[PDB]
Every structure is written in structure tokens, then in C-alpha cells.
Short mmCIF file of C-alpha atoms in Angstrom, two decimals:
data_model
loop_
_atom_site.label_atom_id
_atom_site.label_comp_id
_atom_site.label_asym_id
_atom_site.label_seq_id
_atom_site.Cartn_x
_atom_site.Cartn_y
_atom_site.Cartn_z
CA UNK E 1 -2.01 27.37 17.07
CA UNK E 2 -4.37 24.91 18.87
CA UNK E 3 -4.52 21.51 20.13
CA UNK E 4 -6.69 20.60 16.98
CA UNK E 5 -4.67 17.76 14.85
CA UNK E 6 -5.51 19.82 11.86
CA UNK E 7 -5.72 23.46 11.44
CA UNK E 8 -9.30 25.36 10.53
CA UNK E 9 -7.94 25.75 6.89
CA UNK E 10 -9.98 24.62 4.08
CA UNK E 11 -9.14 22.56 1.56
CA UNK E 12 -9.50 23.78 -2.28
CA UNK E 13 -11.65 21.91 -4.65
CA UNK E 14 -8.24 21.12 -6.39
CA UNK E 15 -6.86 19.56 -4.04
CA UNK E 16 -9.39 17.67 -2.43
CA UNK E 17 -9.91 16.35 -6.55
CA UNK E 18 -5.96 15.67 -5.98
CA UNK E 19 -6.66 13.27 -3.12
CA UNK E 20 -9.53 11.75 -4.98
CA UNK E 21 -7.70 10.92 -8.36
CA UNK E 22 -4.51 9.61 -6.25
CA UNK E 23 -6.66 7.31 -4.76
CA UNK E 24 -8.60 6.29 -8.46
CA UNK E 25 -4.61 6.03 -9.91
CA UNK E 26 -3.88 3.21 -7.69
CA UNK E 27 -2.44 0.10 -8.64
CA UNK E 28 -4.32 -3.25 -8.31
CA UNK E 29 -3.79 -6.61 -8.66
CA UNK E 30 -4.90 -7.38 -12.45
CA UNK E 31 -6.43 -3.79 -12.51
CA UNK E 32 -9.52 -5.18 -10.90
CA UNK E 33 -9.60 -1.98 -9.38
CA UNK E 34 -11.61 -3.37 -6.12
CA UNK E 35 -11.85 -0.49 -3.96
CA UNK E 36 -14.81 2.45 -3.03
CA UNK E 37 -14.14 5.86 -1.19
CA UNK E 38 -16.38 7.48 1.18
CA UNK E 39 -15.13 11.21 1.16
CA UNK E 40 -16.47 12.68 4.78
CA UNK E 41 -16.67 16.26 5.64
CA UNK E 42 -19.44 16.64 7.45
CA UNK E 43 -18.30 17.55 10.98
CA UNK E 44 -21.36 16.16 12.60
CA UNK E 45 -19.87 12.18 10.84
CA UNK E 46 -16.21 12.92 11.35
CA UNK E 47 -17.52 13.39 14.75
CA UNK E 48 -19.15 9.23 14.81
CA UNK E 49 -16.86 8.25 12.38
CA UNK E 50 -13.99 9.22 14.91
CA UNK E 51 -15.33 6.86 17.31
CA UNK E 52 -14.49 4.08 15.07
CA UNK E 53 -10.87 3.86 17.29
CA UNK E 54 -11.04 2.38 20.24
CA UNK E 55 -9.59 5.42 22.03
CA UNK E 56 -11.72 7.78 19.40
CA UNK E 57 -9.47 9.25 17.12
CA UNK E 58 -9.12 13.17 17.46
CA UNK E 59 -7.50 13.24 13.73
CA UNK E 60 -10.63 12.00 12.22
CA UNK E 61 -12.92 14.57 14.50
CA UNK E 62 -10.32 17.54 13.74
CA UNK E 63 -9.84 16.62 9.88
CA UNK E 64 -10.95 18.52 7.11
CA UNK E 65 -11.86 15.15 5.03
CA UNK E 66 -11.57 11.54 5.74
CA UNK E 67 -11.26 9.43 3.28
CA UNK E 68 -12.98 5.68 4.07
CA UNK E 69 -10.97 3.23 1.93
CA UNK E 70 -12.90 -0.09 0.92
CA UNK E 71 -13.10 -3.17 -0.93
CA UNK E 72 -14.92 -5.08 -2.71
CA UNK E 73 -13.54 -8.88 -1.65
CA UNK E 74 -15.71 -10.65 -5.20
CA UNK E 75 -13.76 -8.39 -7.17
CA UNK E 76 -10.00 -9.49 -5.60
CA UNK E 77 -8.77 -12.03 -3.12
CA UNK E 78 -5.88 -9.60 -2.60
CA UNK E 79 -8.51 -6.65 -1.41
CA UNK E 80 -6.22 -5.92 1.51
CA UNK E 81 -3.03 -4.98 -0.39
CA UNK E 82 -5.15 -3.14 -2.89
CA UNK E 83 -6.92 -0.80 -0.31
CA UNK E 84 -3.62 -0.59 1.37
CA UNK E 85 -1.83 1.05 -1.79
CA UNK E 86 -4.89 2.99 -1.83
CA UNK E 87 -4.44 4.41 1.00
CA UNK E 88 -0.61 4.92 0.78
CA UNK E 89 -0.69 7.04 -1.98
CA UNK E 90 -4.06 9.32 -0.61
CA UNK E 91 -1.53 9.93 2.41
CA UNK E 92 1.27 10.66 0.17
CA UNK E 93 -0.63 13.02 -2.37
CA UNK E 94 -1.73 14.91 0.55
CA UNK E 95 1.90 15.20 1.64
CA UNK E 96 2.87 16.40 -1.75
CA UNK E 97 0.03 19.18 -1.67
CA UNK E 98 1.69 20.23 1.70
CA UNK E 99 -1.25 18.70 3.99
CA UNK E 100 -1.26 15.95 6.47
CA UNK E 101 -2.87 12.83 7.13
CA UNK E 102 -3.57 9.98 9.20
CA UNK E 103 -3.78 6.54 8.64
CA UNK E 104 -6.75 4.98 11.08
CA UNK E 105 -6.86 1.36 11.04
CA UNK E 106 -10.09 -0.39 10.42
CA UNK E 107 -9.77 -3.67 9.46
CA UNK E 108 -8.98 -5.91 12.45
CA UNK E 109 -9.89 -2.96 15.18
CA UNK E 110 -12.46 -2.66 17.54
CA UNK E 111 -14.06 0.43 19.00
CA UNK E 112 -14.37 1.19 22.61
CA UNK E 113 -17.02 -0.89 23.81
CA UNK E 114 -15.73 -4.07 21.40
CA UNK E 115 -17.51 -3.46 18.32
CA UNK E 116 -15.64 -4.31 15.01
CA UNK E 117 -14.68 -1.12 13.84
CA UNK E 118 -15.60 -2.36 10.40
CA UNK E 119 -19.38 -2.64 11.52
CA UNK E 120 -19.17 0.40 13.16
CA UNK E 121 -18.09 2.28 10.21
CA UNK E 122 -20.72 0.32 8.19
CA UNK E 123 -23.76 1.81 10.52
CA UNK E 124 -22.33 5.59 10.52
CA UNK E 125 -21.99 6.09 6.85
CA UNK E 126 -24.54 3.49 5.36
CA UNK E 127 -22.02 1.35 3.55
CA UNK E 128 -23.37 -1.94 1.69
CA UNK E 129 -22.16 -5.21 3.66
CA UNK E 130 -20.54 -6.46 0.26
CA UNK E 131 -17.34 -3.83 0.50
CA UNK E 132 -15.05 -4.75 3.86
CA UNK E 133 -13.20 -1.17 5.51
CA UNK E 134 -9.44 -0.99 5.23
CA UNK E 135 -8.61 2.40 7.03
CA UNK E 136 -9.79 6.02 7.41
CA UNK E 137 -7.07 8.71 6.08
CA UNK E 138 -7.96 11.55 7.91
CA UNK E 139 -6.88 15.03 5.86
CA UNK E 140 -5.96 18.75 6.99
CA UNK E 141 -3.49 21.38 7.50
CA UNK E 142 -1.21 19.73 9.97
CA UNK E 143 -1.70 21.43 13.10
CA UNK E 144 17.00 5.59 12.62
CA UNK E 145 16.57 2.92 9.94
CA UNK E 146 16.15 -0.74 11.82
CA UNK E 147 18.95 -2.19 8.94
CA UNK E 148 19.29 -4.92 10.68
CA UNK E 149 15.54 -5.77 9.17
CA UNK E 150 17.59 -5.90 5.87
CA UNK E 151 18.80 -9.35 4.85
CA UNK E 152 21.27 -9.70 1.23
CA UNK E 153 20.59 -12.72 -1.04
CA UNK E 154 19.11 -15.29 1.94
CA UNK E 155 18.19 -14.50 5.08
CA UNK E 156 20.42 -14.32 7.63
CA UNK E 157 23.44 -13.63 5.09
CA UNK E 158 26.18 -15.77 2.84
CA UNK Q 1 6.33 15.61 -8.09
CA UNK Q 2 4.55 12.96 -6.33
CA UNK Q 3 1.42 13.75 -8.71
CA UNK Q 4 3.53 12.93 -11.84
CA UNK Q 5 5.01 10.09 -10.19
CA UNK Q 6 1.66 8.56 -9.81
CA UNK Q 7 0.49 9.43 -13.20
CA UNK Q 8 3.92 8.24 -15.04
CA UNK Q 9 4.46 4.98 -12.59
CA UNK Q 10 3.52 1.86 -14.49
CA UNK Q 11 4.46 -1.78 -13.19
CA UNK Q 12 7.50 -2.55 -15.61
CA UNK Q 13 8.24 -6.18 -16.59
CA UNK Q 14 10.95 -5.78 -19.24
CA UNK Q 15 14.49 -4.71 -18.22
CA UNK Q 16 17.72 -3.74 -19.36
CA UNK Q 17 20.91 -5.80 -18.57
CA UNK Q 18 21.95 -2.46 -16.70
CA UNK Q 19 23.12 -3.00 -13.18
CA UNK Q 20 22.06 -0.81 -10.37
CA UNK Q 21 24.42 1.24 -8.09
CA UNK Q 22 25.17 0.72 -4.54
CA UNK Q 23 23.72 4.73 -4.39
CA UNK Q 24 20.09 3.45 -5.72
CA UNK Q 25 20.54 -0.46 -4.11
CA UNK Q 26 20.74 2.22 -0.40
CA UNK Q 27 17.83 4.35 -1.28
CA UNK Q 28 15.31 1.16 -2.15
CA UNK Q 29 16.30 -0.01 0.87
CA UNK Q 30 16.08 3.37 2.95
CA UNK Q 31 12.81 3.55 1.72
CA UNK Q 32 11.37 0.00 2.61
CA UNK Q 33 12.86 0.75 6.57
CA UNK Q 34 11.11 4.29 6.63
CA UNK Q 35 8.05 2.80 5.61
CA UNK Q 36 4.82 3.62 8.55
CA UNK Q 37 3.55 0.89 10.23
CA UNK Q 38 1.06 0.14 12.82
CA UNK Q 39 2.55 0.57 16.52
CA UNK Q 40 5.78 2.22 15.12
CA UNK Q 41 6.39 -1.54 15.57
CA UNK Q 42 7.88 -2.59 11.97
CA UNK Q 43 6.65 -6.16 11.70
CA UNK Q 44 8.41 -6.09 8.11
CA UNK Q 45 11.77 -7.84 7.04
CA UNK Q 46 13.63 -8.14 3.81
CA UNK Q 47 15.73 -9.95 1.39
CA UNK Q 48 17.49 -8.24 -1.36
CA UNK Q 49 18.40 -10.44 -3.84
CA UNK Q 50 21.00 -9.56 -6.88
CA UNK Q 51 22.00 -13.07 -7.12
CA UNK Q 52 21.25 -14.17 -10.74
CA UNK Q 53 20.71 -18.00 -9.60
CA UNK Q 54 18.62 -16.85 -6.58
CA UNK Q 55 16.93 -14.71 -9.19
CA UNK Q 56 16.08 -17.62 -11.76
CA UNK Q 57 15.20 -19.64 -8.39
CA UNK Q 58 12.30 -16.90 -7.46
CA UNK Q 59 11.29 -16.64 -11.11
CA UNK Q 60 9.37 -19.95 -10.55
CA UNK Q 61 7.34 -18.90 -7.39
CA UNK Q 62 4.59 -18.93 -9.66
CA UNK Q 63 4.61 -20.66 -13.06
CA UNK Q 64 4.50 -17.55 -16.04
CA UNK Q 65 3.74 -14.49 -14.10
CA UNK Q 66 6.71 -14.10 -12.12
CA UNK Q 67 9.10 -15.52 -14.88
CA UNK Q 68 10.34 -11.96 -15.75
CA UNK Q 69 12.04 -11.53 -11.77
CA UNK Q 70 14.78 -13.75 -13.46
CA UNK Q 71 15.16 -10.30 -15.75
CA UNK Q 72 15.75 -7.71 -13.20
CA UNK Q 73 18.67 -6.44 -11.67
CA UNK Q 74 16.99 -6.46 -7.79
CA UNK Q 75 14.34 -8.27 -6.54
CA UNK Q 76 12.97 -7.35 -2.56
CA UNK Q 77 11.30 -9.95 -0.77
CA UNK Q 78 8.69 -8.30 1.56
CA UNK Q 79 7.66 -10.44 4.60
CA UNK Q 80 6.27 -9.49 8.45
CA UNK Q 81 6.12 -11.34 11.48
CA UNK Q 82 2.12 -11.89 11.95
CA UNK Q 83 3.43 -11.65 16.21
CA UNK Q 84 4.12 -8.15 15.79
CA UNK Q 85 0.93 -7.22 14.13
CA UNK Q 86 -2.34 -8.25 13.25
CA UNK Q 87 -2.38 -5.93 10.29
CA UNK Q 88 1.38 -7.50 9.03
CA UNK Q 89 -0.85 -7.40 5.42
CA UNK Q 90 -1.46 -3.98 5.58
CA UNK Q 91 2.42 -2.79 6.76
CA UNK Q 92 3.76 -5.48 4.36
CA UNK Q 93 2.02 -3.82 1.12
CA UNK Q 94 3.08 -0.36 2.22
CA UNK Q 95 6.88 -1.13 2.35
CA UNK Q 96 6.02 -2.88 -0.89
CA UNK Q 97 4.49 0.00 -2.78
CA UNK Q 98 7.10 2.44 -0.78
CA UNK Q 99 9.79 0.37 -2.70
CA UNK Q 100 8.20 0.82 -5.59
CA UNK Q 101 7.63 4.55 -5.72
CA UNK Q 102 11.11 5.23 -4.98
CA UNK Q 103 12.36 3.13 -7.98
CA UNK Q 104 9.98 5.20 -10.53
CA UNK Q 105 11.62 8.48 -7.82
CA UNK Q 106 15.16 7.14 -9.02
CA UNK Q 107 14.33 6.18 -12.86
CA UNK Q 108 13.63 2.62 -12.41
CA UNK Q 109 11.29 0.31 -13.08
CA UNK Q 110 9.34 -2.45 -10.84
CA UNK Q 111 6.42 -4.76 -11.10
CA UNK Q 112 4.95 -6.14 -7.39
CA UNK Q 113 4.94 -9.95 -7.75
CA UNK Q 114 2.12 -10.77 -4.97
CA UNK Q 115 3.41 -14.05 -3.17
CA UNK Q 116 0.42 -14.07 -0.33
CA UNK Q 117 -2.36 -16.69 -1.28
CA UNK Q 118 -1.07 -17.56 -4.38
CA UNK Q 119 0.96 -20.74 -5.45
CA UNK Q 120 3.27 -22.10 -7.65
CA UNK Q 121 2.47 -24.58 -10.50
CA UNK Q 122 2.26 -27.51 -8.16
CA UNK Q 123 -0.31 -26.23 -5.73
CA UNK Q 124 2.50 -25.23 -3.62
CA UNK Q 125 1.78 -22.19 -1.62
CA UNK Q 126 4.62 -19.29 -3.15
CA UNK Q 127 5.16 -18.47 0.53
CA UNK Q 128 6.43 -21.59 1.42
CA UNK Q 129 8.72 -21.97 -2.20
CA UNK Q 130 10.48 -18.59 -1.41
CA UNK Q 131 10.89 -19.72 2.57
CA UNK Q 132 12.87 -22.84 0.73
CA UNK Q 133 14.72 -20.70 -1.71
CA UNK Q 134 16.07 -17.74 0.62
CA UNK Q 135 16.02 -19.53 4.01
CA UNK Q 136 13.38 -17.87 5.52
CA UNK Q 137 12.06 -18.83 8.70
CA UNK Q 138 8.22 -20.13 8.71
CA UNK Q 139 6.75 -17.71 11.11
CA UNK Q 140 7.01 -14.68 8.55
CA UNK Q 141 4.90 -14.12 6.48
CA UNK Q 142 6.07 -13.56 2.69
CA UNK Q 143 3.28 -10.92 0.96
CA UNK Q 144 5.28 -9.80 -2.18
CA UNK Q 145 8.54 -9.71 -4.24
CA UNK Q 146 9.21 -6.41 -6.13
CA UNK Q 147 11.63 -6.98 -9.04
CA UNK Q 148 13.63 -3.77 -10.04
CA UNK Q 149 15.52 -2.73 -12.62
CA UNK Q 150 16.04 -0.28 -16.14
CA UNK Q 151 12.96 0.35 -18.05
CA UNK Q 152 12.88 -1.94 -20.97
CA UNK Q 153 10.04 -0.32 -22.91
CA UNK Q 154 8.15 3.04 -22.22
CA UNK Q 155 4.75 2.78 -20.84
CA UNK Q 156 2.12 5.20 -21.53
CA UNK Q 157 0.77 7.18 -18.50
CA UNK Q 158 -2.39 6.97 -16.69
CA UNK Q 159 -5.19 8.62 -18.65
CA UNK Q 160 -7.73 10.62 -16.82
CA UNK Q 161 -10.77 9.82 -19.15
CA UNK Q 162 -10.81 6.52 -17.47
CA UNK Q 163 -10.92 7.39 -13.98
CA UNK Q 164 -13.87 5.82 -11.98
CA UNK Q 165 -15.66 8.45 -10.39
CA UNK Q 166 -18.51 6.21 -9.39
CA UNK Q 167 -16.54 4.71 -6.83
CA UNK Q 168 -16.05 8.11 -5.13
CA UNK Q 169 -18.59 8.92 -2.73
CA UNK Q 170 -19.49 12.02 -0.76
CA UNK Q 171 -20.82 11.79 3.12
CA UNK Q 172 -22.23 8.07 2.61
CA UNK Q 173 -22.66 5.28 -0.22
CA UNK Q 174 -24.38 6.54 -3.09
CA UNK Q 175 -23.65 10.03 -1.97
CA UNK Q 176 -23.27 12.91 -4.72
#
């Protein structure tokens, strides 16, 4: 063991294919099929692209992968729930293939000195202005129900 | 597993008159609660409708494309309190697609029905016509309504051939 978030262990070619076609199976609204995925695992750019939290994100700079989920906002007004779903089921695939994952939240985040994290992501990894960053999934070997949130037929009850 | 649950799942908008148990009525709604969220927070809330007249009463949220709700056995309203979180869109649309991976999990079928920045035939925002049909109050946020129930018809699964591989890209945009 270590402190690392994510163990040393590679990922196969299968599964890191796995992640990708989870994320290419995705549902969208009218199958427009907005999103793009930057697949990192360079050390060296998990290492920027972890500052993209305002506290830096040691999940991202211990990962194996990251996974930069994006949209294109021309393509669907809905872009947010699209790259969402997106990046639901890369988190759950990796699950299934007994890895873990992170969820880092781009989109309305700022790094540490105020920057949106959205144009900070941009300027590490080249990205085209037209696609908008939802989230960075970071990937590795991993290192009380509120039902009163439930409401039947109306809210409140009757 | 969740591989060929992803593969198989298809949005379903033709159902059987079969009613759902209390068993599968517990684990849709298990699995909206256990959903992640930024800050642990859970900005989410839901109504779980079985009421046919309620159902009929969403079916017009907006005009022909949610007229099929009236059809299922279950539909979950998905809202979030935009106080609790700036990213309410984001924890919203998990809970939504959480919902609906646990239906295909239990043998059902669901189609989302997105509610957020659409309207109804009047110009109506949906949002505000389902906060008038289920009571909701204004400060949340409705995103979606997931109708449930039994597959109707069969739907094919995804085929691979068609996967977009161009919008995969390694280290940075237009990477190979």
C-alpha cells in the first residue's frame, strides 16, 4: 500500500477500450451524440490537468487515465445531462472491470488562483473553444438512504 | 454485467399493462437516494407517481413526446434545489440515469423525458406545468421524468460498427 489514490497497476488495452466504448454507448438526447473524450495518461498532463481543482486533485495526478468529458453545446441544448450520463457510466464501467474512479467537477469550478477550471483545462490539453468541459473521471486500481427526499404521487404526500 | 447492461439498455416507450411490485417500486427508489453527488450534499428530490390521472396529467408536459408517460406503470420526477448546488444539473441527470439502469438491472423498461428547458405546447416552460401538477415548490428545479414499466417491444442492442471513435482522443484534441 501507499498514499497514492490509485495503485501503480496498469490498465490492459481491454479495458481501457471498455471505458472508451461505455462512454461512446451513452445515451443522448435525440442521439445527437454531443460529447468528445480526451483520454490522458501522460503523467507529466495528469500532473497540470490535476490542478484543474481548486485544491489540485491527487486522483487525477495518481490515476492511470483520466478521461476529459465534453460537449459540443451547437449539437444539444441539453449538453450538460448528456456529458453527465457520459460520465456516469465511464465511472460505472470502470467499477464493473473492478477499478475505481473519480468524478472531478469542471463545469462551474475554479482552480486555485480563480481561473475557470473549464479554461484551464482548455490551455493544458489544447481543446477547441467550441466543446465546454463537464468533468474529469480519473481511472486506476483503487488504492443511509435520505427517504425522506422521496415524495409518492405529489409532493409532500396525499 | 454492467457491460451488457449498457449494450442491451435502450430507452423503451411502449409498455405492458403489468404493474410493478413494491420489491422493484424499493429498488428504483434505493437507487435514485444512493446516487453520488457533489458535496455528499444530495440537492435531488423525488416524486413517484403510480397515479393513472397524475400519469395522464404529466403526459402533457410536452405536447407528443411525453404522451407515452400516460403508458407506464411508474413515472420519477427528478428535481434539485439549485441552493444546495451549483451543479444541481449534473447530480439531477445522474439520479436520472441511476434510475434508469436499475430498471434495465430489474427487467424493466424506461425512457428519460427531459423537462429542463423545454416546454409544453403553449410556450409554457414543462418545469413550471409539472410544479402545477404534483405541487412542487418553485425553488426546485425539475430536470427529468423517467417513465417505467414492462417492455412492450424488444429493442435491438447497441451495435459496435457504429461507434464514433473520432470523438476519442488520446493526450490532447486531435490526438491519435
Amino acid at each position: 500500500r501507499s498514499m497514492r489514490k490509485f495503485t501503480d497497476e496498469e490498465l490492459t488495452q481491454d479495458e481501457v477500450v471498455a471505458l472508451m466504448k461505455a462512454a461512446l454507448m451513452s445515451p443522448s438526447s435525440k442521439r445527437s451524440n454531443s460529447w468528445q473524450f480526451v483520454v490522458v495518461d501522460d503523467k507529466e498532463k495528469l500532473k497540470e490537468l490535476s490542478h484543474c481543482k481548486e485544491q489540485a486533485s491527487s486522483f487525477i495526478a495518481d490515476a492511470a487515465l483520466a478521461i476529459v468529458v465534453m460537449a459540443d453545446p451547437l449539437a444539444s441544448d441539453v449538453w450538460i445531462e448528456d456529458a453527465s450520463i457520459a460520465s456516469i457510466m465511464i465511472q460505472l464501467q470502470a467499477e464493473d472491470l473492478g477499478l475505481g474512479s473519480c468524478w472531478v467537477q469542471v463545469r462551474e469550478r475554479f482552480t486555485a488562483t480563480g481561473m475557470p477550471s473549464d479554461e484551464f483545462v482548455h490551455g493544458i490539453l489544447d481543446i477547441p473553444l467550441q466543446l465546454q468541459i463537464l468533468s474529469v473521471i480519473a481511472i486506476g486500481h483503487k488504492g443511509h438512504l435520505q427517504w425522506e427526499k422521496i415524495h409518492i404521487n405529489k409532493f409532500g404526500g396525499k
